[PDB]
Design a protein around this motif. Structure first.
Motif, PDB file in Angstrom:
ATOM      1  N   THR A   1      39.214  37.585  36.398  1.00  0.00           N
ATOM      2  CA  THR A   1      39.957  37.069  37.607  1.00  0.00           C
ATOM      3  C   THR A   1      41.510  37.358  37.683  1.00  0.00           C
ATOM      4  O   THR A   1      42.101  37.002  36.663  1.00  0.00           O
TER       5      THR A   1
ATOM      6  N   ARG B   1      45.591  36.566  39.832  1.00  0.00           N
ATOM      7  CA  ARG B   1      46.333  35.900  40.779  1.00  0.00           C
ATOM      8  C   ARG B   1      47.568  36.472  40.655  1.00  0.00           C
ATOM      9  O   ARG B   1      48.175  36.411  39.936  1.00  0.00           O
TER      10      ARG B   1
ATOM     11  N   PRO C   1      37.097  37.095  51.313  1.00  0.00           N
ATOM     12  CA  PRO C   1      36.967  38.154  50.341  1.00  0.00           C
ATOM     13  C   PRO C   1      36.611  39.391  50.807  1.00  0.00           C
ATOM     14  O   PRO C   1      35.659  39.378  51.797  1.00  0.00           O
TER      15      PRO C   1
ATOM     16  N   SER D   1      37.361  43.180  44.350  1.00  0.00           N
ATOM     17  CA  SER D   1      37.309  42.317  45.763  1.00  0.00           C
ATOM     18  C   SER D   1      38.788  41.556  45.737  1.00  0.00           C
ATOM     19  O   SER D   1      39.262  41.113  44.909  1.00  0.00           O
ATOM     20  N   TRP D   2      39.175  41.262  47.096  1.00  0.00           N
ATOM     21  CA  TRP D   2      40.373  40.513  47.221  1.00  0.00           C
ATOM     22  C   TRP D   2      40.398  39.247  48.039  1.00  0.00           C
ATOM     23  O   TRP D   2      39.704  39.482  49.157  1.00  0.00           O
ATOM     24  N   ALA D   3      41.313  38.530  48.221  1.00  0.00           N
ATOM     25  CA  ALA D   3      41.299  37.332  49.102  1.00  0.00           C
ATOM     26  C   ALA D   3      42.753  36.609  49.058  1.00  0.00           C
ATOM     27  O   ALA D   3      43.051  36.269  47.863  1.00  0.00           O
TER      28      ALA D   3
ATOM     29  N   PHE E   1      45.284  33.654  49.742  1.00  0.00           N
ATOM     30  CA  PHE E   1      45.169  32.080  49.850  1.00  0.00           C
ATOM     31  C   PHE E   1      46.286  31.879  50.948  1.00  0.00           C
ATOM     32  O   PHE E   1      47.521  31.718  50.769  1.00  0.00           O
TER      33      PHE E   1
ATOM     34  N   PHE F   1      49.368  33.586  47.779  1.00  0.00           N
ATOM     35  CA  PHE F   1      49.219  34.573  46.871  1.00  0.00           C
ATOM     36  C   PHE F   1      47.802  35.044  47.044  1.00  0.00           C
ATOM     37  O   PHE F   1      46.674  34.649  47.515  1.00  0.00           O
TER      38      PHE F   1
ATOM     39  N   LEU G   1      44.175  37.055  45.309  1.00  0.00           N
ATOM     40  CA  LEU G   1      43.254  36.831  44.339  1.00  0.00           C
ATOM     41  C   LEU G   1      42.436  37.960  44.261  1.00  0.00           C
ATOM     42  O   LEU G   1      42.085  38.606  45.444  1.00  0.00           O
ATOM     43  N   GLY G   2      42.089  38.496  42.887  1.00  0.00           N
ATOM     44  CA  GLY G   2      41.313  39.637  42.864  1.00  0.00           C
ATOM     45  C   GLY G   2      40.103  39.302  41.950  1.00  0.00           C
ATOM     46  O   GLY G   2      40.515  38.395  40.957  1.00  0.00           O
ATOM     47  N   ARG G   3      38.861  39.712  42.273  1.00  0.00           N
ATOM     48  CA  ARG G   3      37.921  39.446  41.307  1.00  0.00           C
ATOM     49  C   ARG G   3      37.148  40.867  40.924  1.00  0.00           C
ATOM     50  O   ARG G   3      36.605  41.457  41.807  1.00  0.00           O
TER      51      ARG G   3
END
Lengths: 264, 276
Positions: free
Chosen positions: B143, B145, B201, B222-224, B226, B236, B238-240
């Motif tokens: 993951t 950030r 996401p 995938s991204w999300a 905050f 910020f 987030l990537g997974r």
């Protein structure tokens, strides 16, 4: 060569000075006239002294961290270290923002002051943010914490949130984290909490918490705090140390437990 | 006196750590000089070098200069846990070049007839995930950030076995630099889709990351974002990411334009938006 070039900013900023270091070969290469003034010590000491031993031991790590020749910008991104002071005790907070050049690592050192000293911070802007893990450890702290509590980022980053709380208020945190678990992302106000200022004295805050649900795991990933200084302390010198103890590990472990439930 | 162990007691005790584990050794360093007071038998084995050119070395000097800073950070006398009565870092260590180690530092008292506090270190060699014991494909995830200015604010430790980078390599550095030049403009679109949505996401393969070695590894990302509670802006991203295909070169740890300043500022601008 240089020297005039430090006599650059300081007539508009009284609190700054400059220092060039050889790295990681030599050390103290050059230094502005006013490091003496600021550090209340004749430059007879700005010898061929290891710059690093002017820093406090906790700060040496973060210092070397930021001053990697590799990740440095060219003169033409900052950290905070405490600087002596005179051979000890006796320490001062400075913002160091470093760069790269060659002299015949350059950093600007701006000295940091209390919010509770002239110039005071408007009480309505005495605000700072914090982020902490579910295990209740500081994951991040706002630079504003320094002038309002006396702590550099390094002092809190990784330390237990609970340890910086007044014991009478340490029991309050479970309830708070329970309501954080509810609302699942939504912030809620809750006053007041006392934080220990680095001078040993307590300072009361108006608090708000939210906390962030991890988009994939649906567990809480960290908790957000937005605090406003309710009352200034007497000892405005928050920066200088003084010189039921496990409510902490206990209560931490309960919140962490509570926080491990996913919320969908 | 128990708090203070001897070299012989240490040589024995470590030959137990490096018994149920083969990638580990121990080192004690003086707080007075950073000199190595004791290195354990496995180090020569792991570091492909004789134990001759050891004792009396300033342990710092065996590190890569970039890893030197995070070392002094965590070997602070005051923050260290006492041995056998705990928050590690990762440093590459010079050999015969460098190898990646997880360093778990402690404090203790060592003799060699008067007793001297030393930093004791548990060093465990880090390995590729594309190596026995391989990381199962469906678990080849890390993951990330990053800030709205596009700087890595945090990265998962799985990053190391999958791409070769220790946390210090990325923290503070430009996300878009670790991406394939060709997939950089892709981030713009991703940051709009994030800005299409307060942080639910969204899958979007594929993106290619450089691997320090320096090979490209295709990821299913995938991204999300905050949304910052009090700002209502994205605070910020987030990537997974899951490894799509492994690199041909399994050894990702070992090393071989200004679209970057531009796109970042563009992306950052985007994230100033109030959302929606």
């Amino acid at each position: 060569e240089l020297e005039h070039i430090t006599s650059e900013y300081t007539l508009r900023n009284q609190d700054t000075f400059s220092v060039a270091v050889s790295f990681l070969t030599g050390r103290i290469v050059y230094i502005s006239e006013q490091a003496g003034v600021l550090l209340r010590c004749k430059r007879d000491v700005f010898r061929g002294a290891r710059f690093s031993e002017l820093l406090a031991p906790q700060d040496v790590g973060v210092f070397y961290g930021s001053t990697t020749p590799s990740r440095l910008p060219t003169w033409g991104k900052s950290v905070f270290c405490r600087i002596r002071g005179g051979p000890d005790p006796r320490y001062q907070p400075f913002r160091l923002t470093p760069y790269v050049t060659k002299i015949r690592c350059l950093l600007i050192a701006e000295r940091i002051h209390s919010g509770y000293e002239a110039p005071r911070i408007p009480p309505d802007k005495r605000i700072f943010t914090t982020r902490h893990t579910p295990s209740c450890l500081f994951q991040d702290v706002d630079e504003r914490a320094a002038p309002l509590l006396g702590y550099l980022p390094q002092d809190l980053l990784g330390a237990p949130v609970l340890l910086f709380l007044h014991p009478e208020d340490r029991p309050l945190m479970l309830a708070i984290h329970k309501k954080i678990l509810q609302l699942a992302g939504q912030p809620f106000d809750h006053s007041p909490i006392r934080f220990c200022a680095r001078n040993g004295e307590y300072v009361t805050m108006d608090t708000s918490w939210a906390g962030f649900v991890h988009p994939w795991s649906r567990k809480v990933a960290f908790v957000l705090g937005r605090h406003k200084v309710r009352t200034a302390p007497l000892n405005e010198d928050v920066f200088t140390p003084p010189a039921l103890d496990s409510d902490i590990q206990e209560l931490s472990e309960q919140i962490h437990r509570l926080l491990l439930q996913p919320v969908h």
